[PDB]
Amino acid sequence: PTINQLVRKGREKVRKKSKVPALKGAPFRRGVCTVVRTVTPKKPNSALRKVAKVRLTSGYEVTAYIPGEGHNLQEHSVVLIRGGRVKDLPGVRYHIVRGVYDAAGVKDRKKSRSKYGTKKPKEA
Amino acid sequence: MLTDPIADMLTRIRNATRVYKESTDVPASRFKEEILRILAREGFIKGYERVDVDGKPYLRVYLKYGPRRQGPDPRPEQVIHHIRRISKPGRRVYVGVKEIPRVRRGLGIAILSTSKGVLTDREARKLGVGGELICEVW
RNA sequence: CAGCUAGUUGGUGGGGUAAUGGCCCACCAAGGCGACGACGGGUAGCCGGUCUGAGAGGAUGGCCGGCCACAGGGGCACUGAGACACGGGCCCCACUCCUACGGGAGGCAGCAGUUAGGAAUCUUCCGCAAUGGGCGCAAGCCUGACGGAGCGACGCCGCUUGGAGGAAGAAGCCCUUCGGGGUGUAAACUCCUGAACCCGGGACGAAACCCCCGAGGAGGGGACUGACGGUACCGGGGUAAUAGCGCCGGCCAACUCCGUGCCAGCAGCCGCGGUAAUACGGAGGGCGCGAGCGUUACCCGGAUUCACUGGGCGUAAAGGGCGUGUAGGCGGCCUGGGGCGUCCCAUGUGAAAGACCACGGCUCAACCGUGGGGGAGCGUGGGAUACGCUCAGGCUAGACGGUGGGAGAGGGUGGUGGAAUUCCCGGAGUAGCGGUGAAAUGCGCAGAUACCGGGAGGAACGCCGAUGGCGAAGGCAGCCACCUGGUCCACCCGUGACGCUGAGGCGCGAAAGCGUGGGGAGCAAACCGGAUUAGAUACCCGGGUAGUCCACGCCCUAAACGAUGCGCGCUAGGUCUCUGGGUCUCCUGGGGGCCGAAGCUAACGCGUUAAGCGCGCCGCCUGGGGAGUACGGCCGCAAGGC
RNA sequence: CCCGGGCCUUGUACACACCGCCCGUCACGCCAUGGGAGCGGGCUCUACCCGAAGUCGCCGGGAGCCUACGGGCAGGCGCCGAGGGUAGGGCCCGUGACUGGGGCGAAGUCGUAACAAGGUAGCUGUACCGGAAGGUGCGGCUGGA
RNA sequence: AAAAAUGUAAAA
RNA sequence: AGGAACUCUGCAAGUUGGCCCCGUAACUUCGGGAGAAGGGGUGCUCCCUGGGGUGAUGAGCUCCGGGGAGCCGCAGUGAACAGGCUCUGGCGACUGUUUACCAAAAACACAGCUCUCUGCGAACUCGUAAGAGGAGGUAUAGGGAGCGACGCUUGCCCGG
Numbered sequence A: 001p002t003i004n005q006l007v008r009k010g011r012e013k014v015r016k017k018s019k020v021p022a023l024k025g026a027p028f029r030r031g032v033c034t035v036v037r038t039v040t041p042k043k044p045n046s047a048l049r050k051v052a053k054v055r056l057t058s059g060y061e062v063t064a065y066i067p068g069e070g071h072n073l074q075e076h077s078v079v080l081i082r083g084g085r086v087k088d089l090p091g092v093r094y095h096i097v098r099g100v101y102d103a104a105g106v107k108d109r110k111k112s113r114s115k116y117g118t119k120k121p122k123e124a
Numbered sequence B: 001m002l003t004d005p006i007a008d009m010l011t012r013i014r015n016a017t018r019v020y021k022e023s024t025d026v027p028a029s030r031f032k033e034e035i036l037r038i039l040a041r042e043g044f045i046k047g048y049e050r051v052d053v054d055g056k057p058y059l060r061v062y063l064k065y066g067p068r069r070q071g072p073d074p075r076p077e078q079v080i081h082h083i084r085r086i087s088k089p090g091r092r093v094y095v096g097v098k099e100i101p102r103v104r105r106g107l108g109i110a111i112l113s114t115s116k117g118v119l120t121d122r123e124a125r126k127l128g129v130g131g132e133l134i135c136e137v138w
Numbered sequence C: 001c002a003g004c005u006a007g008u009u010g011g012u013g014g015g016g017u018a019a020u021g022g023c024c025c026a027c028c029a030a031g032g033c034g035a036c037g038a039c040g041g042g043u044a045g046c047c048g049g050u051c052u053g054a055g056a057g058g059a060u061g062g063c064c065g066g067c068c069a070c071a072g073g074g075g076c077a078c079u080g081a082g083a084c085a086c087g088g089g090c091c092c093c094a095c096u097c098c099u100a101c102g103g104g105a106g107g108c109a110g111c112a113g114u115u116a117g118g119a120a121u122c123u124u125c126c127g128c129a130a131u132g133g134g135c136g137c138a139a140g141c142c143u144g145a146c147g148g149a150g151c152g153a154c155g156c157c158g159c160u161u162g163g164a165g166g167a168a169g170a171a172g173c174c175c176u177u178c179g180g181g182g183u184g185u186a187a188a189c190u191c192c193u194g195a196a197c198c199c200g201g202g203a204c205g206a207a208a209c210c211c212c213c214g215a216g217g218a219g220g221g222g223a224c225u226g227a228c229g230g231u232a233c234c235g236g237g238g239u240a241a242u243a244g245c246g247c248c249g250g251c252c253a254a255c256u257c258c259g260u261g262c263c264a265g266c267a268g269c270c271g272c273g274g275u276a277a278u279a280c281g282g283a284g285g286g287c288g289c290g291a292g293c294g295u296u297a298c299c300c301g302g303a304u305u306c307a308c309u310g311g312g313c314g315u316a317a318a319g320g321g322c323g324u325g326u327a328g329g330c331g332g333c334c335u336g337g338g339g340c341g342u343c344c345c346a347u348g349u350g351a352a353a354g355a356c357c358a359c360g361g362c363u364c365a366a367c368c369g370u371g372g373g374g375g376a377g378c379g380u381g382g383g384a385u386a387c388g389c390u391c392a393g394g395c396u397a398g399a400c401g402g403u404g405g406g407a408g409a410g411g412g413u414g415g416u417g418g419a420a421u422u423c424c425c426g427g428a429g430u431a432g433c434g435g436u437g438a439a440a441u442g443c444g445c446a447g448a449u450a451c452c453g454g455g456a457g458g459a460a461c462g463c464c465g466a467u468g469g470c471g472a473a474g475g476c477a478g479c480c481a482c483c484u485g486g487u488c489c490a491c492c493c494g495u496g497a498c499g500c501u502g503a504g505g506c507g508c509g510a511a512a513g514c515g516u517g518g519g520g521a522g523c524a525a526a527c528c529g530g531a532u533u534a535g536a537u538a539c540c541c542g543g544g545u546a547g548u549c550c551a552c553g554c555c556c557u558a559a560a561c562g563a564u565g566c567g568c569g570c571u572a573g574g575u576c577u578c579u580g581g582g583u584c585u586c587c588u589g590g591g592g593g594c595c596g597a598a599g600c601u602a603a604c605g606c607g608u609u610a611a612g613c614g615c616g617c618c619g620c621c622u623g624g625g626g627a628g629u630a631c632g633g634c635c636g637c638a639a640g641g642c
Numbered sequence D: 001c002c003c004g005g006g007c008c009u010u011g012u013a014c015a016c017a018c019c020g021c022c023c024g025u026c027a028c029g030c031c032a033u034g035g036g037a038g039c040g041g042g043c044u045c046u047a048c049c050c051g052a053a054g055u056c057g058c059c060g061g062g063a064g065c066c067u068a069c070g071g072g073c074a075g076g077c078g079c080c081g082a083g084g085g086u087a088g089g090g091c092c093c094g095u096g097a098c099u100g101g102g103g104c105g106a107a108g109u110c111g112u113a114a115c116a117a118g119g120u121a122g123c124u125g126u127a128c129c130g131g132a133a134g135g136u137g138c139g140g141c142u143g144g145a
Numbered sequence E: 001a002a003a004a005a006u007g008u009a010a011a012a
Numbered sequence F: 001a002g003g004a005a006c007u008c009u010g011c012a013a014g015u016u017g018g019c020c021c022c023g024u025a026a027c028u029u030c031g032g033g034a035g036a037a038g039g040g041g042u043g044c045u046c047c048c049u050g051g052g053g054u055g056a057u058g059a060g061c062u063c064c065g066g067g068g069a070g071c072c073g074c075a076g077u078g079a080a081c082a083g084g085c086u087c088u089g090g091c092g093a094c095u096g097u098u099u100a101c102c103a104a105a106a107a108c109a110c111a112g113c114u115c116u117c118u119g120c121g122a123a124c125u126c127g128u129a130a131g132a133g134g135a136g137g138u139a140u141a142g143g144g145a146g147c148g149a150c151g152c153u154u155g156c157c158c159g160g
């Protein structure tokens, strides 16, 4: 543009919205797992993904993905939301924390125990 | 009606030099003289003098160039590598004494209009004054 | 969010306060504010500072420091130098508790501590010993301010889990061309040190108020007190003494084996997995980092992806459809005063904490003390005048005007000419015409087609006519006249910077469409029929309405296309065309088209008719889809448009 | 001319490359969203009615107390006044039978409109019409020859 | 100036 | 005391009622919706005061009004005259007309739309006729038919 154009109009501020509606951007939100079902993946994949809708205590209701090999969440489990979408499942924009509350960790796991919530074992 | 005589003037030089002309004219003016005055003081023009274009006081700016070049496309060197205006009639650029720019680490010059005359990028600094940054040359 | 305002704006007089003031009252006058964004809505305490960043900028205001505001919600005034008063008071509201039912108590957004909520945030500690505060002649009293401890890898910093040696190289584990390779000096083991732990000693922080001579002062000499603490620190005695997390396809540093078989599962981006995966899981090994590693979240960065620095708009997102002009923005050559912008000096200022540099303190650091530096901006005084600005005088190069000529499908009105189509009348004449790729529907023995004469009506204008001209765009063609805009060249005659651009606004704006009235030849959505086709709401054929035309009014869109906004300046030229000037195998001004110097460009391609070099102004773009939709607002009869 | 092949040229939205690609209705599932008889909820504006405490103003009289008799205090009325109440508008949020279109999907159905004269050049404003893409009309643009 | 429709879904 | 529980139906009755001022939505053909709604005032006494008519420019007379102080009752248009309101659907646009004497409507009439006849000695109507109306009008006129303001719009079928 010109100088006057800037003097009047001005550069429009960027401003970007969040990829995750988790309230106060709180690290993790707590909720009670309502539905615990397995949905089929999207375009390039097919491997029945263990997902679970969780009616937050913050009044919300979203779907979260359970990592690891299996789990133990029923119709009334409590759990935390990690926050992190899955490009293979339409709508799932929240991971589900492991080892926290009713949500147990992963059995047998060795490497990367951190993410999959598994207190280090003992070989001896 | 034009706007900044200097703007189009510096352009006369630019377009001319690009095609390697002997010299070019431009409506006579006080400030333009100062421009060439310094544009010769540091050595970028062979010189200048008021001429006539049908009863119209102009200014013949005699251009300076470099030695002939060997190899593909014998392009004669450009004395005035680059000259562009800074303080536009749109944006009047006023700089302070300890703000005056250093055109290409000294290799260049900043023709500006001080509050006590017209000086180079260094000359203005020496005298210890600031002014409107007309343009730079290198 | 586009208009807002009755104490509203101002005035006179008065009330009230420490004091000015619609702060408040009575009376009077209509003013006050706003696209430089009033009014509304949303959000939020502000700064010093902090975070990031090459800087400019962006983000931010936790701790400490300064100002502000509140003390359950909400109002009030009393006391006082000061309050609308956290630990005061009165009243209403919600809530809690007592109650002899008449009444009464109470406020942690003070330290600590509950409970709720949440992802998540500490002991109901010690002392007035130090510092500061209140009262007091003093002694001394109180002090959850503070000094200090306690819990939490929450952060930054220092340290420990050891050091030297030690096999051509244990054991196990992994790999293997079965030779060997790897873990790996790693360990075992030898030797030295010695955190932890033990014993003894054991602070600074403290001096002063208090006593004495002098004069109850100045000066000088004497005396009391330590929460932390029996802590840190000093000396001696002293045991090898916790290691974890992420990654290993590319980005990105780290490769192999088994298992699995589009399962399980990974995923930040691209992607991997469907029998041999360095990408899922385990292992061996390696890479990084270390009392940490890693995830999620949020901020700056990369992002020159809102571009001042520092973008761009022919086809990639983007020139407004075109014109007129309001604000605003910009400003030709010379001379003069002013000195507003701006430039320089001096000065007040910019407090402390911080950041930076320097020295120093705590064993170092973190932390901290001390000193030095210049700081943007603003206040005052002085100075300069170059360009911007401003008043003033002069010029003619921009723009305008005069005189004189020219070209043109520029526009509007009235009139008018031939050709041809259809129709009707009359003449003559007979079996077919028409139509397609083919054919049919259709038209004709009631006399068609073809041809001849007369008439009626509507619409469009052949040849001239083009690589043409004209206008702002849309757009404009037979012919004559009227009225009328724009444009060009010559004479350099007049004016004397009068200019460029243009948010909003005003006007124009193809075609289709709507409204009242008029006209209707041909053509022609829709619609009817024939044929093709699986189907054929279509391509072709036959018939046919609105519309196409006139008037007046509205609609306002388009591939409105050069897909290229407007204006002034500079930058080879060759070629032909429209038009104008001139003693003219040629020169000069305006317009149209091709090819190309330099140059720009992602390429194509542009290139004096720029997409070149440069200034001024508006318009506009910031991934695709969603969607030119939805809502709101405005316009319209509607369709629909902005 | 049919099938197959070669060199040059033109076009292209095709690139294990015309068995390529590709459009729209309809059908099933999913996600978000617009309108919707309404309902519910917050904030806000105006008019009026009631009106605590309290300052201020008046009275303090047929009534109380105080008094250096001039006055004071109590008390009463009034103004304003928190909030409460009634009626009516503005904005925002949630919700709602049904409905509109949109996005999404290894597979369906119906055609083939688009890219090659895509086998009627295509695109386009507007109009009309049809299961659907789309056809046709009036004009316009080449991004057609 | 050339009557004639259509090929779903797994690797460079 | 309650407040539509009555009943086919708030039928009837009751509520509201006049003026003054405040204030007033959806929607809309911008005219309206409007008296929308909802709400305040209304008497008497004293005092100040603005304007018009007549008339001399004022005295009296007379019309409409402004401000302040106060008095009495349960009640101030103190009696009589004197809308109850709102939301939503159907039909008909609307004012109008009708079954004198059980129906006032959604019926008819209407403006405006369309079709059709009629060229004047008009068509049509009454009359046997003369004649008259039409009309001392002339296709922007007249007769007949249907539809019924306005907006959007009106599809295919001549075989009978």
Ligand SMILES: [Mg+2]
Pocket (backbone or CB within 6 Å): A070, A071, A072
């Ligand atoms: Mg399970």
Ligand SMILES: [Mg+2]
Pocket (backbone or CB within 6 Å): A102
């Ligand atoms: Mg449990």
Ligand SMILES: [Mg+2]
Pocket (backbone or CB within 6 Å): B020, B021, B022
């Ligand atoms: Mg040369």
Ligand SMILES: [Mg+2]
Pocket (backbone or CB within 6 Å): B046, B047, B048, B049
């Ligand atoms: Mg010279």
Ligand SMILES: [Mg+2]
Pocket (backbone or CB within 6 Å): none
């Ligand atoms: Mg007042």
Ligand SMILES: [Mg+2]
Pocket (backbone or CB within 6 Å): none
């Ligand atoms: Mg006063």
Ligand SMILES: [Mg+2]
Pocket (backbone or CB within 6 Å): none
């Ligand atoms: Mg006063």
Ligand SMILES: [Mg+2]
Pocket (backbone or CB within 6 Å): none
């Ligand atoms: Mg006070």
Ligand SMILES: [Mg+2]
Pocket (backbone or CB within 6 Å): none
């Ligand atoms: Mg006043």
Ligand SMILES: [Mg+2]
Pocket (backbone or CB within 6 Å): none
């Ligand atoms: Mg007044």
Ligand SMILES: [Mg+2]
Pocket (backbone or CB within 6 Å): C037
């Ligand atoms: Mg603003």
Ligand SMILES: [Mg+2]
Pocket (backbone or CB within 6 Å): none
């Ligand atoms: Mg708020």
Ligand SMILES: [Mg+2]
Pocket (backbone or CB within 6 Å): C044
């Ligand atoms: Mg706030």
Ligand SMILES: [Mg+2]
Pocket (backbone or CB within 6 Å): none
């Ligand atoms: Mg940067």
Ligand SMILES: [Mg+2]
Pocket (backbone or CB within 6 Å): none
């Ligand atoms: Mg920094």
Ligand SMILES: [Mg+2]
Pocket (backbone or CB within 6 Å): none
């Ligand atoms: Mg805090």
